[PDB]
Amino acid sequence: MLQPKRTKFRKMHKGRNRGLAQGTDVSFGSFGLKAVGRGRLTARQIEAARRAMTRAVKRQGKIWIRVFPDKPITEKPLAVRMGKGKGNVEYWVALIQPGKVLYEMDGVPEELAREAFKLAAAKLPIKTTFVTKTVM
Amino acid sequence: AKTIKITQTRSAIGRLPKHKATLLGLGLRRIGHTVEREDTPAIRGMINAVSFMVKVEE
Amino acid sequence: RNGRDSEAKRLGVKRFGGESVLAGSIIVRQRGTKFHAGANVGCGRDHTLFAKADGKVKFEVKGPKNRKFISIEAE
Amino acid sequence: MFTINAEVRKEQGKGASRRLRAANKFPAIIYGGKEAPLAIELDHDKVMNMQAKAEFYSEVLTIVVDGKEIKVKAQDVQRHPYKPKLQHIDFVRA
Amino acid sequence: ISRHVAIPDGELEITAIRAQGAGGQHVNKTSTAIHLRFDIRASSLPEYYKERLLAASHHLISSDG
RNA sequence: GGUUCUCCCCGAAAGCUAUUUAGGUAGCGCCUCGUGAAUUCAUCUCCGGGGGUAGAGCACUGUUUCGGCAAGGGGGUCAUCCCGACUUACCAACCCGAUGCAAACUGCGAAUACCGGAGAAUGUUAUCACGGGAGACACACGGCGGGUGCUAACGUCCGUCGUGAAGAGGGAAACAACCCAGACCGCCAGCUAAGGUCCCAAAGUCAUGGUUAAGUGGGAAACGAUGUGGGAAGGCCCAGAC
RNA sequence: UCCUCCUAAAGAGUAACGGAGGAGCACGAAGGUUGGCUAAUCCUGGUCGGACAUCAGGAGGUUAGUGCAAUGGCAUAAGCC
RNA sequence: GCUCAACGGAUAAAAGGUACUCCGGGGAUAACAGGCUGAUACCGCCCAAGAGUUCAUAUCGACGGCGGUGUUUGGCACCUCGAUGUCGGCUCAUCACAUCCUGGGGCUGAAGUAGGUCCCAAGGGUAUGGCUGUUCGCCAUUUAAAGUGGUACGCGAGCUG
RNA sequence: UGCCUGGCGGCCGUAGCGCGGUGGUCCCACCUGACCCCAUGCCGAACUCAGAAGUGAAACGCCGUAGCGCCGAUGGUAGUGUGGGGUCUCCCCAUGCGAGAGUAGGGAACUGCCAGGCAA
């Protein structure tokens, strides 16, 4: 997992998830995995795919994880009554909006890069899509 | 300041007091009301807000 | 395990810009000093900018640092 | 070198913009210098494949609106977030 | 030296059966939350210790393990 | 817990504050009656205003990724006792460029809402002040903006509007709170609303052009698949391709 | 019980066993007025002094400071002498 | 002159027990059950490194994910506190299929015998006892198999207590 | 009046910074001395007096420079009041309102009062 070092707070609001994404463009790499859907990517999910992605390309190329969870969402201990303050932080989720590019890759030929992301897609909950960079 | 007829089509029950008072400002009372007024942005502005439930007859 | 609060102290603008006030009429009730006193406007110990003369209100932004000022024109 | 036919718009806002985006068309804007920014509407389908050619972003076009041909250059593009499709292209009148 | 309790989740079958004793009518209707284990000898993995956990007699573990 | 004849008129709330108070009560808000008063009050147009929320942005409070750079602690050929020559393959900040996040961040910033003034029309004066008498202070749900919850609940707690509460009638098969719509009364009168028009059951087995083979319609996901229609583009192609 | 920010949906106000921290004082001076002054942290050199001693110059710029928790505010200083 | 900090302060005053309990009320508010949800549990599935001599998918399958059922434990208090007798055993059962056996088939890391796994199928069948109040469970020994659950976790105006 | 300088306001980053050049009858700064008024929690630097030979580096003004900061359309997008709809943990449609960011481009100020100077 990827935990943000030294946060200002501990626990916050759950907020709302709506709106499109910022990183529509593809930089730092050649190809990427843009997110079509709108969901919640937990830390263990993001960790799972990235490990499994470099497994496919076999150490050649570099990865750009253009996101970070940094939003602590709690859980109450089971069988407890609804009340008595907020429970403890359990994991880290990042809100992914439609159009957010998750992982990047360069220095690797298209086809092998194609299957790596395709095998990285099955670890994710939300519906994604493949995307190619473009000059301007 | 041209003479213009205003028709009330729908009923105002599930509306806001802002929209309900607009009907009171135009004299529209019951369903099937035809009252003759004049034109100016002050009057037409009232029709501009609730044009969904009122029908205009210039 | 903290659950404490404070009953709000009613801040803000009680008499907005464009209305004729009386002498001693509180214009803006501010905790800080965002607004600074202009012509015929006094500053209290709680920096509550109130009126001195009688007339209408003008929210004129003046000063090199562009702080917001309020004055009163005799109206 | 791009036969991009276009028509001058008459409705330029939010509501009318998408009604033609549903009819396979997207708006553009030709601006440059002292002239007035001409509201341009063009067919979406065509340019969807025209930007596949890399030299499209660095060369002059042969865009014609009402007979007369204007020479312009591609400035920038605002594409759709997740759906790989065009929305609005900024044209610098060259 | 490096001690972190494993106890494999997805390897241990936990059975919740009712309790025993006194305490009213509360103890015999919703006291099924009481736990009874199920740790088969087939989830060993040290290869030598689990059989030495089966041969030497003690309670909590039957004649099968 | 119960509280017995009739008609007519108007018409609530389940909120704030305090409470040895939380199923009670008092004041106010809301209601009714009487009285006295100012084009008083509401909607709309215009004008004069501050707000900083949504969104957005990343100088600032923090946080995040990559690239360029970089002293210091240390590893080492070593000082082979400090100094010191050099490198740095190392932890590699400070800084520059590029990429994102934020209720408790703002170099920015709406729509609405709100306050004041002017003008027209409408409204049995709907605004306010005073006096008598009240009730009530356990609210529910739906839309929207949110906290908590598991972005579960016919869940719980707030802002706001509607409705029920205290409103039947029509529709959603049945169904307070969903949609349409406000019952003075009589009629074997007509026209429309939401919703529907083969039959049960009032209304078209309506008109034209397309679509699906699953009874899909008539419960649902990731994912998989020469189901199949439409549109665009690309490869090869009677120097005859699959 | 009181105070600050957020929740609080850009007026005010608005609840929860919702999210974060403080108060139950201090002072004749840190009050009033007059006059002057206004930084923090780094780079450089220099007696021991080296991580930060003092001074000098420079960059920088209010990230300082303000008896205290937090917010707003402050040099026309409410900051310092 | 009051930390009258329960801080609009009743008045210093005042700790507890009640299964010997009693009275007035409440499903506004708990225990069993039903209802909504499905965190948990159970079941199925997607992806796939690896194990499996070779080989991802004979057989399992980490790291992660998407759904279903409403049987475990729970969340909420919507129904009943001017009553809904609550465990287990006996008795009598009935239904569903995610099937223990019989039956019909695919694959096999299926030679034969004997097995593993999955699909179709609910007509019928689906232990006797020791120990414990027990459901469960353990054990001895049989059997083609001694299935899993719903039915107030069936059934006390039928029985035992 | 063309230009100058100094003082005080309006407008108050298009107005301001960094860099290069440059001005002195007049003006300003620097500068000379400080036994006298006054001054340093030491010190003629700051403060103030009495003069002002000399200079124009510094300071300030002026010109060029966009080398930086700043300003900022048109269009589109986000958002959204109101009335409807869907697949209703979010979006679509009609309609009114309409950003921020970014691009083109603009841009190193303008103006008033007063006092003497300058060739009048």
Q: Is A120 helix (H, G, I), strand (E, B) or coil?
A: helix
DSSP string computed for A47-113: HHHHHHHHHHHTT-SEE--------EEE-PPTT--S-SS---EEEEEEEE-TTEEEEEEESS-HHHH
Smallest CA-to-CA distance from E36 within E62, E57, E56 is with: E62
User: In terms of C-beta density within 10 A (0-12 exposed, 13-18 middle, 19 or more buried), how is residue D80 classed?
Assistant: middle
DSSP string computed for D51-73: TTSGGGGTS---EEETTEEE--E
The answer to whether A24 and A99 are in contact (CB under 8 A) is yes
DSSP string computed for chain E: --------TTT---EE----S-SSSSTTTS-TT-EE----GGG--SSSHHHHHHHS--SSS-S--
Cα atoms in the 13 Å half-sphere on the side-chain side of A112 = 13
Query: What's the Cα-to-Cα distance from D81 to each of A68, A122, A132, D59, rounded to whole Å?
Result: 20, 22, 13, 26
Report the alpha-carbon distance of residue E44 to residue E65 in Å, rounded. 10
Amino acid E16 CA to nucleotide F52 C1' distance, rounded Å: 56
Query: What's the Cα-to-Cα distance from A14 to each of A83, A89, D14, D34, D71, rounded to whole Å?
Result: 16, 12, 32, 51, 52
Experimental method: cryo-EM
Report the alpha-carbon distance of residue A75 to residue A84 in Å, rounded. 13
Q: Where do the domains of chain D lie?
A: 1-94
The reply to whether A129 touches chain D by the CB within 8 Å rule is yes
Strand G at less than 7 A from CB of C11: yes
In the complex, which nucleotide's C1' lies nearest to the CA atom of residue C5?
G3
The fold of B1-58 is Ribosomal Protein L30; Chain: A, (3.30.1390)
Q: What would you report as the CA-atom Rg of chain C, rounded to the nearest whole angstrom?
A: 14
Amino acid A49 CA to nucleotide F223 C1' distance, rounded Å: 17
Q: A23 contacts in D (CB within 8 Å)?
A: none
The answer to whether A26 and A119 are in contact (CB under 8 A) is no
Ramachandran region, residue D24 (left: φ > 0; alpha: ψ -120 to 50; beta: rest): left
Tell me if there are at least 3 CB pairs under 8 Å linking chains D and E: no
Smallest CA-to-CA distance from E12 within E48, E36, E46 is with: E36
The answer to whether A86 and A75 are in contact (CB under 8 A) is no
Report the alpha-carbon distance of residue D49 to residue A1 in Å, rounded. 41
The fold of A21-136 is Aldehyde Oxidoreductase; domain 3 (3.90.1170)
Query: Which of A24, A99, A136 shows the shortest C-beta gap to D76?
Result: A136
Q: What residues contact C50, with CB distance under 8 A and at least 6 apart? A: C24, C25, C26, C27, C41, C42, C44
Strand F at less than 7 A from CB of A75: yes
Q: How many CB atoms lie within 10 A of CB B6?
A: 20
A108-115 — which CB contacts under 8 Å span 24+ positions?
A108/A30, A108/A57, A108/A60, A108/A61, A110/A30, A110/A31, A112/A56, A112/A57, A113/A30, A113/A31, A113/A57, A113/A61, A114/A31, A115/A56
Report the alpha-carbon distance of residue B50 to residue B38 in Å, rounded. 17
Report the alpha-carbon distance of residue E41 to residue A61 in Å, rounded. 45
User: In terms of C-beta density within 10 A (0-12 exposed, 13-18 middle, 19 or more buried), how is residue D73 classed?
Assistant: middle
Q: Tokens 């089971």 identify what position?
A: A78
Output the six-digit token pair for E15: 């059975």
Report the alpha-carbon distance of residue D54 to residue C11 in Å, rounded. 60
The answer to whether A31 and A120 are in contact (CB under 8 A) is no
CA distance A54 to chain D (A): 25
Smallest CA-to-CA distance from D26 within D81, D75, D93, D90 is with: D90
Report the alpha-carbon distance of residue D89 to residue D79 in Å, rounded. 8
Report the alpha-carbon distance of residue C56 to residue B35 in Å, rounded. 42
Terminal-to-terminal C-alpha distance of chain A:
35
In the complex, which nucleotide's C1' lies nearest to the CA atom of residue A51?
H63
A with D: how many residue pairs have Cβ under 8 Å apart?
23
Q: How much of chain B is in helix, strand and coil states, percent to nearest 5?
A: 30, 20, 45
Report the alpha-carbon distance of residue E21 to residue C42 in Å, rounded. 80
Task: Determine, for residues A135 and D57 on separate chains, whether the beta-carbon distance falls below 8 Å.
Answer: yes
Residue A3 carries which DSSP code? P
Amino acid B45 CA to nucleotide F167 C1' distance, rounded Å: 33
Report the alpha-carbon distance of residue D26 to residue D7 in Å, rounded. 11
Residue A128 carries which DSSP code? B
Phi, psi at A35, each rounded to 5° = -95, 120
Which residues pair with residue C51 across a beta bridge?
C41
Q: String of b and e for C30-64 (b: at least 16 CB within 10 Å)? A: beeeebbbbebbeeeeebbbbbeeebebebeeeee
The fold of D1-94 is Ribosomal Protein L25; Chain P (2.40.240)
DSSP β-ladder status, C35-37 and C68-73? parallel
The reply to whether A34 touches chain D by the CB within 8 Å rule is yes
Q: How many CB atoms lie within 10 A of CB C13?
A: 16
The answer to whether D87 and D21 are in contact (CB under 8 A) is yes
CA distance D48 to chain A (A): 13
Q: What residues contact A88, with CB distance under 8 A and at least 6 apart? A: A11, A74, A75
The answer to whether A129 and A105 are in contact (CB under 8 A) is no
Q: Tokens 């932080």 identify what position?
A: A89
Smallest CA-to-CA distance from A99 within D26, D48, D83 is with: D83
DSSP string computed for E39-54: --GGG--SSSHHHHHH
Residue A4 carries which DSSP code? P
Report the alpha-carbon distance of residue B42 to residue B58 in Å, rounded. 16
The H-or-E segment that residue C27 falls in is strand C26-29
Q: Tokens 């292209």 identify what position?
A: D89
Q: Where do the domains of chain A lie?
A: 21-136
Task: Determine, for residues A20 and D51 on separate chains, whether the beta-carbon distance falls below 8 Å.
Answer: no
Q: What are the helix (H) ranges across B3-57?
A: 17-25, 41-49
Q: Cβ within 7 Å of strand F: which of C 6-35?
A: 13, 15-19, 34
Q: What are the helix (H) ranges across chain C?
A: none
What's the resolution in A?
Answer: 3.7
Which nucleotides of strand H are protein-proximal, with an atom < 7 A from a CB? 19, 31-33, 39-42, 46-49, 62-66, 72-76, 86-87, 133-140, 153
> Subunits with at least 3 CB pairs below 8 A relative to chain A?
D
User: In terms of C-beta density within 10 A (0-12 exposed, 13-18 middle, 19 or more buried), how is residue A103 classed?
Assistant: buried
User: In terms of C-beta density within 10 A (0-12 exposed, 13-18 middle, 19 or more buried), how is residue C4 classed?
Assistant: exposed
Phi, psi at A106, each rounded to 5° = -145, 160
Strand H at less than 7 A from CB of A122: yes
Query: Which of A99, A134, A135 shows the shortest C-beta gap to D82?
Result: A99
Report angle CA B16, B22, B23 to the nearest 5 degrees: 100
